[PDB]
Amino acid sequence: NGPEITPEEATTIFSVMVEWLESRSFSPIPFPPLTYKNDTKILVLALE
Amino acid sequence: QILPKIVDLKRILQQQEIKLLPFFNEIIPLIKSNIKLMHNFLISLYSRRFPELSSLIPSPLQYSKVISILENENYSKNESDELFFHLENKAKLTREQILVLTMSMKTSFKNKEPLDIKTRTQILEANSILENLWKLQEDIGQYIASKISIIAPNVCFLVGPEIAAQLIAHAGGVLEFSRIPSCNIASIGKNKHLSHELHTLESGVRQEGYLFASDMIQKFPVSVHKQMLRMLCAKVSLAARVDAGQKNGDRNTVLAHKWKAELSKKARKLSEAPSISET
Amino acid sequence: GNLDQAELLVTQALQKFPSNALLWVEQIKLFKHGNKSSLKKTIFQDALRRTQNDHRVLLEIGVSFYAEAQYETSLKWLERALKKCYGDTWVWLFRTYARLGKDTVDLYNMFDQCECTPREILLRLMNDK
Amino acid sequence: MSAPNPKAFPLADAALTQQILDVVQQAANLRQLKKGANEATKTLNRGISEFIIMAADCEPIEILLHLPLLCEDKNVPYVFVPSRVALGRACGVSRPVIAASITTNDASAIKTQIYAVKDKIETLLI
Amino acid sequence: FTLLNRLLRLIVDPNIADYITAKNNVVINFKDMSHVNKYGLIRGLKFA
RNA sequence: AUCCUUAUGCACGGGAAAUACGCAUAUCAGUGAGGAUUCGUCCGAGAUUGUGUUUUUGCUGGUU
Numbered sequence: 278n279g280p281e282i283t284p285e286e287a288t289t290i291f292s293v294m295v296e297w298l299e300s301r302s303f304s305p306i307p308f309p310p311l312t313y314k315n316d317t318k319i320l321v322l323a324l325e
Numbered sequence: 326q327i328l329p330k331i332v333d334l335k336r337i338l339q340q341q342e343i344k345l346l347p348f349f350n351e352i353i354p355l356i357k358s359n360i361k362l363m364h365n366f367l368i369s370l371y372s373r374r375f376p377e378l379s380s381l382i383p384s385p386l387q388y389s390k391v392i393s394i395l396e397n398e399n400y401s402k403n404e405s406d407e408l409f410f411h412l413e414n415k416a417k418l419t420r421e422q423i424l425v426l427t428m429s430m431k432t433s434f435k436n437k438e439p440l441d442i443k444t445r446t447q448i449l450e451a452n453s454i455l456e457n458l459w460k461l462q463e464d465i466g467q468y469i470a471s472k473i474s475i476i477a478p479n480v481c482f483l484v485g486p487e488i489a490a491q492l493i494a495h496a497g498g499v500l501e502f503s504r505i506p507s508c509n510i511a512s513i514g515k516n517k518h519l520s521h522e523l524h525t526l527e528s529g530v531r532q533e534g535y536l537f538a539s540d541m542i543q544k545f546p547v548s549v550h551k552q553m554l555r556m557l558c559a560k561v562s563l564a565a566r567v568d569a570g571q572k573n574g575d576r577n578t579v580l581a582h583k584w585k586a587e588l589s590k591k592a593r594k595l596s597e598a599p600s601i602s603e604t
Numbered sequence: 605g606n607l608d609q610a611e612l613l614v615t616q617a618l619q620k621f622p623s624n625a626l627l628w629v630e631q632i633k634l635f636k637h638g639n640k641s642s643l644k645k646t647i648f649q650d651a652l653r654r655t656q657n658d659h660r661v662l663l664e665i666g667v668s669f670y671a672e673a674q675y676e677t678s679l680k681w682l683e684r685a686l687k688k689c690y691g692d693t694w695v696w697l698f699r700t701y702a703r704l705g706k707d708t709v710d711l712y713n714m715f716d717q718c719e720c721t722p723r724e725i726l727l728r729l730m731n732d733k
Numbered sequence: 734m735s736a737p738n739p740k741a742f743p744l745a746d747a748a749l750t751q752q753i754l755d756v757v758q759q760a761a762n763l764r765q766l767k768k769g770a771n772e773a774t775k776t777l778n779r780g781i782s783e784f785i786i787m788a789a790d791c792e793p794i795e796i797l798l799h800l801p802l803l804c805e806d807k808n809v810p811y812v813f814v815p816s817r818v819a820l821g822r823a824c825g826v827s828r829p830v831i832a833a834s835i836t837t838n839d840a841s842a843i844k845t846q847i848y849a850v851k852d853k854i855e856t857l858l859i
Numbered sequence: 860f861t862l863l864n865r866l867l868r869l870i871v872d873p874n875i876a877d878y879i880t881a882k883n884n885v886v887i888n889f890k891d892m893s894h895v896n897k898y899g900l901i902r903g904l905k906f907a
Numbered sequence: 908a909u910c911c912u913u914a915u916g917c918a919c920g921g922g923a924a925a926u927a928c929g930c931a932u933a934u935c936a937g938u939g940a941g942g943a944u945u946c947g948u949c950c951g952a953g954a955u956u957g958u959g960u961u962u963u964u965g966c967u968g969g970u971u
């Protein structure tokens with residue numbers, strides 16, 4: 278039966294997020310860079 | 326120049342509807358090269374307008390069609406479900422392909438400005454060229470599909486003539502296809518691959534081609550699919566190598582008989598499963 | 605004509621030398637209308653491994669794209685050819701941005717640092733396409 | 734022997750086969766070799782091959798007969814050796830092998846055995 | 860998911876979003892049974 | 908005659924591992940095993956199936 282979300286339904290959803298983030302002025306999260314400050318602190322946390 | 330050269334060749338084939346096939350070999354590389362131009366030329370035009378469509382719709386024919394539909398003034402009034410209906414009906418898409426378009430439609434492109442007249446003309450001229458090329462290519466395959474028993478008696482015997490015709494139309498000749506090493510074959514009829522494709526089959530077949538749709542695969546349980554592409558893809562190339570070798574006046578099957586017998590018997594054994602064990 | 609034989613002349617000549625830098629440029633120029641689309645990727649790797657480094661291989665691979673299309677993909681190459689620098693590269697560069705837009709004047713200073721009619725020619729070569 | 738296949742040509746003799754199969758194996762251990770049909774057909778398309786060896790008594794023979802016509806366009810020597818089972822061993826394989834392509838590395842250790850044998854093989858192609 | 864990929868693109872860089880969407884397919888075994896997870900979210904993964 | 912390269916055999920010396928190492932009057936398997944992919948193509952030899960041992964194999968020495 279395929280995905281149940283229906284194209285018309287989807288635009289309504291996706292549009293809300295798009296306005297919210299822009300309203301809120303939200304910069305997107307980047308990809309973790311090869312040289313990154315906190316790589317150590319976030320490995321130790323994660324492995325422990 | 327295209328329309329002039331295109332009209333005759335379709336009729337030049339339809340007028341006949343052997344000597345042509347060697348010309349056919351020359352042609353197949355040529356049409357394909359040009360389409361990858363015009364397709365990549367259309368992208369040049371929408372880099373400004375709607376940058377993501379290059380990714381989300383991979384093939385030229387469905388990209389060229391959505392160029393138009395989306396460009397059309399009439400739908401653009403807005404709150405038209407006509408767009409959706411149209412895509413589904415006109416430029417063949419599946420629900421999954423539309424959902425992406427809808428949302429991607431929100432983030433990127435600007436409908437404040439409707440693309441300029443010059444560029445519109447270019448698109449129209451480009452779209453017409455694309456359509457002409459695509460029709461030509463489609464026509465070629467049918468003619469090939471008619472000659473399959475003649476040019477490739479073994480390959481139709483395994484794969485089926487609907488498909489064999491599709492294969493041989495890709496490298497543009499038996500010779501060319503025999504040159505192809507068997508690992509590269511299975512990936513011929515693959516629509517393309519993009520990140521959000523979201524695929525892992527139960528089969529475990531990472532690549533699904535024209536061969537994947539064939540008889541000698543889908544007549545078997547789903548567990549033995551990834552073992553039967555590989556096992557069949559080799560024997561296609563063996564069959565195709567024989568076809569080039571074979572003299573044009575006389576073509577004899579017989580190789581296929583062994584290569585089906587093995588394949589059907591071999592596929593059974595994979596399915597059969599272990600004998601039960603004494604405890 | 606008979607570029608078909610030029611397939612073999614490259615081969616025979618390339619069997620002998622092979623690391624030569626120029627010979628791979630003509631092996632590349634071939635695939636343009638050499639129409640063998642499959643093996644082009646593998647052969648750009650060999651050309652780039654065999655001679656490594658270089659310029660003209662990087663430039664010619666770049667141009668193989670610009671010739672076709674994908675004016676964005678040929679950027680990487682031509683730009684990658686500069687960091688090893690020499691006038692053959694700059695022509696294709698300005699051509700690309702022409703099919704792209706707006707970067708032209710700022711790149712210009714670089715040209716002077718790599719140096720006179722060179723300013724006057726650039727326009728000469730900019731009128732080619 | 735059996736009737737050597739008429740399409741088999743050039744067919745190496747006894748003394749050349751020893752010299753060829755020995756080079757094969759000598760390359761196997763430096764992994765400059767490539768075994769099998771498709772692996773060999775790949776080589777020519779790329780352009781790295783030195784020469785092809787084939788099995789003469791490969792049953793049926795038509796499955797490799799495409800290699801000769803490809804080799805003649807890339808200007809690459811070739812010969813048939815009289816059995817596949819022997820060629821299987823030299824490549825380091827338990828099991829029968831019908832074709833093999835030595836490749837190019839021009840820093841190689843064995844370089845001078847190869848030029849030796851191609852020189853001998855190209856003689857057979859009259 | 861076909862929605863999920865889009866929403867994560869909104870808040871993240873695609874290279875990660877693609878990974879997150881992919882990690883949820885898998886192929887789930889319990890003893891003899893096996894099914895691919897096309898539809899839902901698996902909640903056993905760390906970023907869930 | 909020296910020197911150098913690869914393979915194989917015996918061997919001093921130095922390490923690592925035994926959830927590892929095998930075996931089959933047994934199925935396939937470069938006439939393509941099994942994988943990777945930037946989707947253009949790229950690597951190329953084992954995978955099944957039953958089974959034996961696996962906190963241990965043989966051998967000495969002390970102390971009671």
Ligand SMILES: *OP(=O)(O)OP(=O)(O)OC[C@H]1O[C@@H](N2CN(C)c3c2[nH]c(N(C)C)nc3=O)[C@H](O)[C@@H]1O
Nearest residue numbers: 842843844845846847848849908909910911912913
């Ligand atoms: O070590 P010995 O003197 O026993 O060698 P033989 O007596 O077995 O006799 C003949 C072989 O000597 C070797 N030599 C010896 N010399 C001095 C020599 C050899 N070979 C060469 N080349 C062939 C480069 N150059 C020399 O100066 C050879 O093996 C003779 O066969």
